[PDB]
A paper describes a structure:
While some archaea produce only one type of filament, the archaeal model species Sulfolobus acidocaldarius generates four. These include rotary swimming propellers analogous to bacterial flagella (archaella), pili for twitching motility (Aap), adhesive fibres (threads), and filaments facilitating homologous recombination upon UV stress (UV pili). Here, we use cryo-electron microscopy to describe the structure of the S. acidocaldarius archaellum at 2.0 Å resolution, and update the structures of the thread and the Aap pilus at 2.7 Å and 2.6 Å resolution, respectively. We define distinct N-glycan patterns in the three filaments and identify a putative O-glycosylation site in the thread.
To tackle the long-standing question of how glycans impact on the architecture of motile filaments, we solved the structures of archaella and Aap and from the glycan truncation mutant Δagl3 at global resolutions of 2.4 Å and 2.6 Å, respectively, and discuss our findings in the context with previous motility experiments. Next, we purified archaella and Aap from this mutant and solved their structures by cryoEM. In the maps of the mutant archaellum and Aap, the glycans were clearly altered. The densities for the sulfoqiunovose, the terminal glucose and one mannose were missing. However, comparing the protein structures of the archaella and Aap with and without glycan truncation revealed no significant differences. Interestingly however, only the O4-linked α-mannose was missing from the N-glycan trees of the Δagl3 filaments, while the O6-linked α-mannose was still present. This suggests that the addition of the O4-linked α-mannose occurs downstream and is sensitive to the addition of sulfoquinovose.
Numbering used by the authors:
A (entry chain X), F (entry chain W): 87 to 156
B (entry chain b), C (entry chain a), D (entry chain Y), E (entry chain d), G (entry chain c): 16 to 156
Amino acid sequence: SISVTSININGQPFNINGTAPSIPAGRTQPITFEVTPASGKPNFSPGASYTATIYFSNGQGAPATLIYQG
Amino acid sequence: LSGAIVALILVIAGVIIAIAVVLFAFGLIPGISNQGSIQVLGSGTITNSTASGSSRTIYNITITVKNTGTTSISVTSININGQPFNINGTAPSIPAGRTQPITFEVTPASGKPNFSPGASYTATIYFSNGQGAPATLIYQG
Amino acid sequence: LSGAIVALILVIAGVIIAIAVVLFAFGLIPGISNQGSIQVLGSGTITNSTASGSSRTIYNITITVKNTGTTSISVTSININGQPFNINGTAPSIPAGRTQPITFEVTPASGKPNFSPGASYTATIYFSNGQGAPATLIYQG
Amino acid sequence: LSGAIVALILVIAGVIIAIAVVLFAFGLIPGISNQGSIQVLGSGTITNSTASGSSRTIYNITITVKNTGTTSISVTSININGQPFNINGTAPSIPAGRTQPITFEVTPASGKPNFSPGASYTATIYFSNGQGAPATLIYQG
Amino acid sequence: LSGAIVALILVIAGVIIAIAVVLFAFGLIPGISNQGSIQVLGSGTITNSTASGSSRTIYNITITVKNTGTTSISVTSININGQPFNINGTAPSIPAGRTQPITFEVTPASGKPNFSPGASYTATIYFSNGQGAPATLIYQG
Amino acid sequence: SISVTSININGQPFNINGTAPSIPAGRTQPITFEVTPASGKPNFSPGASYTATIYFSNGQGAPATLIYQG
Amino acid sequence: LSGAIVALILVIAGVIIAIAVVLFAFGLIPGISNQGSIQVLGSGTITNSTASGSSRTIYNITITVKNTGTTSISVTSININGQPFNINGTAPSIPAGRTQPITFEVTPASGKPNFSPGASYTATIYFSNGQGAPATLIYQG
Ligand SMILES: *[C@@H]1O[C@H](CO)[C@@H](O[C@@H]2O[C@H](CO[C@H]3O[C@H](CO)[C@@H](O)[C@H](O)[C@@H]3O)[C@@H](O)[C@H](O)[C@H]2NC(C)=O)[C@H](O)[C@H]1NC(C)=O
Ligand SMILES: *[C@@H]1O[C@H](CO)[C@@H](O[C@@H]2O[C@H](CO[C@H]3O[C@H](CO)[C@@H](O)[C@H](O)[C@@H]3O)[C@@H](O)[C@H](O)[C@H]2NC(C)=O)[C@H](O)[C@H]1NC(C)=O
Ligand SMILES: *[C@@H]1O[C@H](CO)[C@@H](O[C@@H]2O[C@H](CO[C@H]3O[C@H](CO)[C@@H](O)[C@H](O)[C@@H]3O)[C@@H](O)[C@H](O)[C@H]2NC(C)=O)[C@H](O)[C@H]1NC(C)=O
Ligand SMILES: *[C@@H]1O[C@H](CO)[C@@H](O[C@@H]2O[C@H](CO[C@H]3O[C@H](CO)[C@@H](O)[C@H](O)[C@@H]3O)[C@@H](O)[C@H](O)[C@H]2NC(C)=O)[C@H](O)[C@H]1NC(C)=O
Ligand SMILES: *[C@@H]1O[C@H](CO)[C@@H](O[C@@H]2O[C@H](CO[C@H]3O[C@H](CO)[C@@H](O)[C@H](O)[C@@H]3O)[C@@H](O)[C@H](O)[C@H]2NC(C)=O)[C@H](O)[C@H]1NC(C)=O
Ligand SMILES: *[C@@H]1O[C@H](CO)[C@@H](O[C@@H]2O[C@H](CO[C@H]3O[C@H](CO)[C@@H](O)[C@H](O)[C@@H]3O)[C@@H](O)[C@H](O)[C@H]2NC(C)=O)[C@H](O)[C@H]1NC(C)=O
Ligand SMILES: *[C@@H]1O[C@H](CO)[C@@H](O[C@@H]2O[C@H](CO[C@H]3O[C@H](CO)[C@@H](O)[C@H](O)[C@@H]3O)[C@@H](O)[C@H](O)[C@H]2NC(C)=O)[C@H](O)[C@H]1NC(C)=O
Ligand SMILES: *[C@@H]1O[C@H](CO)[C@@H](O[C@@H]2O[C@H](CO[C@H]3O[C@H](CO)[C@@H](O)[C@H](O)[C@@H]3O)[C@@H](O)[C@H](O)[C@H]2NC(C)=O)[C@H](O)[C@H]1NC(C)=O
Ligand SMILES: *[C@@H]1O[C@H](CO)[C@@H](O[C@@H]2O[C@H](CO[C@H]3O[C@H](CO)[C@@H](O)[C@H](O)[C@@H]3O)[C@@H](O)[C@H](O)[C@H]2NC(C)=O)[C@H](O)[C@H]1NC(C)=O
Ligand SMILES: *[C@@H]1O[C@H](CO)[C@@H](O[C@@H]2O[C@H](CO[C@H]3O[C@H](CO)[C@@H](O)[C@H](O)[C@@H]3O)[C@@H](O)[C@H](O)[C@H]2NC(C)=O)[C@H](O)[C@H]1NC(C)=O
Ligand SMILES: *[C@@H]1O[C@H](CO)[C@@H](O[C@@H]2O[C@H](CO[C@H]3O[C@H](CO)[C@@H](O)[C@H](O)[C@@H]3O)[C@@H](O)[C@H](O)[C@H]2NC(C)=O)[C@H](O)[C@H]1NC(C)=O
Ligand SMILES: *[C@@H]1O[C@H](CO)[C@@H](O[C@@H]2O[C@H](CO[C@H]3O[C@H](CO)[C@@H](O)[C@H](O)[C@@H]3O)[C@@H](O)[C@H](O)[C@H]2NC(C)=O)[C@H](O)[C@H]1NC(C)=O
Ligand SMILES: *[C@@H]1O[C@H](CO)[C@@H](O[C@@H]2O[C@H](CO[C@H]3O[C@H](CO)[C@@H](O)[C@H](O)[C@@H]3O)[C@@H](O)[C@H](O)[C@H]2NC(C)=O)[C@H](O)[C@H]1NC(C)=O
Ligand SMILES: *[C@@H]1O[C@H](CO)[C@@H](O[C@@H]2O[C@H](CO[C@H]3O[C@H](CO)[C@@H](O)[C@H](O)[C@@H]3O)[C@@H](O)[C@H](O)[C@H]2NC(C)=O)[C@H](O)[C@H]1NC(C)=O
Ligand SMILES: *[C@@H]1O[C@H](CO)[C@@H](O[C@@H]2O[C@H](CO[C@H]3O[C@H](CO)[C@@H](O)[C@H](O)[C@@H]3O)[C@@H](O)[C@H](O)[C@H]2NC(C)=O)[C@H](O)[C@H]1NC(C)=O
Ligand SMILES: *[C@@H]1O[C@H](CO)[C@@H](O[C@@H]2O[C@H](CO[C@H]3O[C@H](CO)[C@@H](O)[C@H](O)[C@@H]3O)[C@@H](O)[C@H](O)[C@H]2NC(C)=O)[C@H](O)[C@H]1NC(C)=O
């Protein structure tokens, strides 16, 4: 089982609010988690797509695309 | 001994980063769709809207916009006749799935325009989804 | 004497561990390099499945799909017109080497869509491979 | 004895440096995003801005720029028609998340341009995030 | 001594595995790069095949088709006037290098068409290649 | 002289039916051998490309593309 | 004792070889540009050049060619309107940096073509770069 530890979105660092989700071994899931900007504030536009990097307890990170819904 | 142990770490890391980059390339694809959400319907109008003797020329751009996307989208800039214009006050937005006459105030950023009553100007309107749309605007006076 | 016998042990052990890591690198190749994919053929269709004033809107999605791999693979998500959708019920599994029209039901994950009868929407279907395919779906009504 | 003790140190150091390099490769990834922050909207304008009889030709470049990034970004250079230009005074900056008509003074670094009234010049604008953007500029006189 | 012999093994094994991947890349070329296609020549025709008040409407489709590839290829779907149709019975297979009038029967997949005698409909035929061809069909009655 | 010891097609294990084919020293040649799926039931499609990794008596594995004909 | 000295030499040599490989990667770039040294510009002409009812029809291929490379470059082969053709004489060659008319005699490689006065035919001329340039020849004879 491995958990998220940080996310960076559109270049900006974010902190996970509350307990970070843990993903069980061998499993596919939609995870959901809350985040706050670490410093500054973002300028997300409805329907725009942002490159993000999620970092896991492995130290491994994954590039991702997130679409801002509103 | 060291070299083989190092090569093993870098092989496994190579597989992990390569797969993550391939998944990212598949993961981009949904974002591309939204670049086409807006289209501009018919001729719009430009109208001189400033008060008498005011320091700033301010015009009024009315256009029908259609939003085929799943999110609200806003006008971010307009280029008229080759001139960039600044958008005054709050940008207008068009709701998801709707078609509406949209109205906004603009002021010229380069020089001053010399619009002629009943003359037809090609604009390009730019929207918050990162899209440009060609438009025709008729100056009303 | 000692230094030379130890140097020889570490030469021999170096050969052994280096060859073990080289054989491991050859052993990765089958897992990382499976060719072939789910291919999506022609346009699909979206149809309103929602009935009897139900609280959740459900859509049929029908599309022709060709599995060119050697294993059965299933749909896992679809994104349509930028919006994410969940598969309702059990997702369809496409047998190895086979071409089929698949049909599956979907609900919007959040918000709601604004499909127009006869309009064409870009969609991305994601399979159990993590591979996705861009597709065009025409909304039927 | 010595050889085995040395090999042990170099094995453990090998693991540590290899892991640190793998973590660095994952740690680079957020920096790549920022290379796409800017885009240039519509035609800009060039205007001759120098005073009568002055030794230096100085032009005025007005363009709409959109910053989708999370930080302020500034214009660092412009190349017009294939000529490099120097940027005079302070570089302009566009705030995080905003779309603005941006204006700056430039002077030619190679030879002199011979801009023609109403003629259209392809430029490339370069920004402090390390990004180039193609632009069209119309010379106003 | 050990470190250098291990470095040399990993140089040699690196050459071997790199050349193996380069030879694999050359080995992909024939499968990914088959030239030539089904070409659709002139207009086709749609004719009402439905008889005796049958519950399902069936249409003849006749069109001239030229296979410029080296393998026999079959139709798999047609879309006409935006609407999907299923091939009834066994789909026709077009021999390599050959020009033929093919004829096949089709039924609407969902809904029903509104063909007008003498009107021309844009259609897309999809072949076993996954390749499709736009076509014009004239409805005969 | 070096022989095919095992083959994996598109990630799946496969068994050489007959005796193993063997290629003499210094030779370049066509090599042909009969093979069966080791587990399950694959289904190849005409003109589609499948990777095979062929493993030789060196322990060496070579990736190859096979195009299905049948 | 030796293991550390060997590790140091291979660390230092690793830096040298990695930098050398990076420099080699750039050093290819001016080289590969020569792949596009030739431009064929304007319309060319093709003219009957044979005499006295001789057994070979021979033609006049005149084109204007610009060589941007640092070596003299020659016509290796020509294909006219899809058909193979053989240069009768020795190949024409265009010096480095020159723009000039180039003229050469050519014969059909197979069959018997028949050009019509004032009609336009494509030729692709293949140069000693392996580069092919399409050109239009107008027939004169
Ligand atoms: C970040 O994580 C906190 C837990 O790590 C979480 O605390 C919990 O808060 C909920 C209720 O929170 C509501 O009210 C607060 C004001 O008190 C708002 O800031 C917040 O946004 C919510 O509207 C409470 O039921 C629960 O017991 C708390 N848990 C713990 C362990 O303290 C924060 O709420 C969360 N921050 C946000 C903004 O959601
Ligand atoms: C997400 O929701 C937040 C709460 O509604 C909102 O923050 C509030 O924003 C207003 C002013 O910010 C303006 O700019 C943002 C740009 O994203 C607009 O979305 C928003 O409509 C306003 O025009 C501020 O006065 C108020 O104090 C904020 N409240 C909080 C909770 O901080 C965010 O703006 C909104 N979007 C983003 C990208 O975070
Ligand atoms: C920019 O032009 C807009 C288009 O006319 C306008 O907003 C619109 O308002 C009109 C109605 O305007 C009349 O009626 C109001 C009373 O309801 C009076 O205040 C005013 O004097 C008018 O003659 C409406 O029909 C239209 O739909 C609105 N906009 C849209 C969505 O098209 C603005 O007033 C104008 N602004 C300036 C400063 O010129
Ligand atoms: C928008 O309306 C303004 C008045 O509501 C008007 O200002 C007046 O301008 C006139 C003269 O207009 C000419 O000269 C100006 C420069 O002075 C040009 O920009 C303009 O295109 C005309 O060629 C002036 O006599 C008067 O004092 C101004 N004020 C009032 C109360 O009348 C703007 O000129 C007008 N702009 C456009 C484009 O029509
Ligand atoms: C480079 O061009 C700029 C674009 O015009 C300009 O800055 C802009 O200033 C204009 C307003 O200029 C007029 O009004 C001021 C009085 O407010 C007078 O000083 C001047 O004589 C003008 O006719 C403004 O509309 C525009 O938004 C500004 N820039 C932007 C962000 O677009 C500079 O003045 C000019 N510099 C030179 C040396 O040419
Ligand atoms: C989406 O695909 C479903 C199968 O995956 C399909 O279910 C089948 O429904 C048919 C009957 O469907 C008719 O009636 C419904 C209303 O009940 C209409 O919405 C529909 O358009 C048809 O007119 C039934 O015979 C069959 O046994 C069902 N099979 C399964 C596996 O459920 C849905 O009908 C289909 N939805 C639409 C709108 O086509
Ligand atoms: C698919 O069918 C759904 C069931 O009939 C329908 O949802 C119902 O819609 C009405 C009002 O939504 C309106 O807007 C949609 C736009 O798509 C129109 O198609 C529809 O005619 C109405 O004008 C709502 O009152 C009712 O509660 C909904 N019922 C459910 C099951 O949610 C959808 O609207 C329809 N289309 C789409 C795109 O999902
Ligand atoms: C989403 O998938 C569910 C299975 O994963 C499926 O449950 C099955 O439902 C059918 C009958 O469903 C009808 O009635 C319900 C209300 O109870 C409606 O919401 C629904 O739309 C249908 O009209 C039942 O025969 C079957 O046993 C259920 N299977 C299981 C495993 O529970 C849901 O119906 C499906 N949602 C929709 C909207 O189709
Ligand atoms: C920008 O404006 C300057 C004046 O504000 C102008 O300087 C004048 O130039 C004219 C003649 O211009 C021609 O010749 C010059 C070389 O002398 C060329 O660079 C230019 O493109 C024209 O072909 C001269 O008679 C006069 O004395 C100068 N000064 C004034 C006060 O008029 C610049 O030439 C002008 N640059 C451009 C590109 O328009
Ligand atoms: C190599 O090209 C350089 C680029 O032009 C040039 O240095 C530049 O000098 C120009 C200005 O040159 C003009 O003005 C000076 C008077 O100030 C005259 O001496 C001369 O005749 C010119 O027409 C300057 O704009 C530019 O910024 C300088 N260089 C840079 C940093 O771009 C050199 O003169 C030239 N050298 C040779 C031998 O060709
Ligand atoms: C669509 O193509 C069919 C062949 O793929 C063809 O079947 C042949 O039919 C002919 C006789 O057709 C005549 O009679 C039917 C009514 O029975 C009319 O609909 C039709 O227009 C003709 O007047 C028969 O001799 C032949 O053996 C059949 N061959 C096969 C392979 O079935 C259909 O007739 C054709 N439909 C139409 C409307 O032309
Ligand atoms: C769609 O394809 C079927 C074969 O895939 C074909 O079945 C054949 O049918 C013919 C005779 O069909 C006639 O009668 C049926 C009613 O039984 C009508 O629906 C049909 O339109 C024809 O008038 C038969 O000789 C042959 O043996 C069948 N072949 C097989 C393999 O079953 C269907 O007829 C065909 N549908 C239509 C509408 O033509
Ligand atoms: C799978 O491998 C077997 C050995 O590697 C091979 O055995 C050889 O068989 C041939 C003759 O086989 C025929 O008869 C058998 C029944 O006994 C059939 O199953 C088969 O299809 C053939 O028709 C024999 O001459 C030879 O000596 C055998 N070799 C050895 C080493 O014993 C099988 O033939 C092979 N399977 C197939 C289907 O070829
Ligand atoms: C697939 O491989 C089978 C053996 O690996 C082979 O069966 C053996 O067939 C040969 C017949 O000799 C011919 O083999 C093929 C065509 O059959 C040609 O490439 C070749 O030049 C010869 O003409 C037979 O002698 C032998 O006993 C069979 N079995 C063994 C154990 O050797 C199949 O023929 C082959 N099929 C295809 C389509 O390639
Ligand atoms: C086709 O190419 C030949 C070499 O590229 C070229 O040979 C040259 O010939 C000229 C003189 O040729 C005359 O005489 C011959 C008979 O021997 C006739 O066929 C021809 O039409 C001319 O009348 C000679 O000076 C030169 O040295 C030769 N070059 C070489 C490299 O040997 C042929 O002339 C050419 N065909 C034609 C029709 O010109
Ligand atoms: C077609 O090209 C032939 C050679 O490629 C050429 O024959 C050679 O002719 C020249 C004569 O010199 C003249 O060439 C043409 C007109 O004849 C003019 O463009 C050019 O300016 C010269 O006036 C002769 O010296 C030479 O020996 C011939 N052969 C070779 C191998 O060079 C034809 O003249 C030419 N025909 C046409 C109509 O362009």
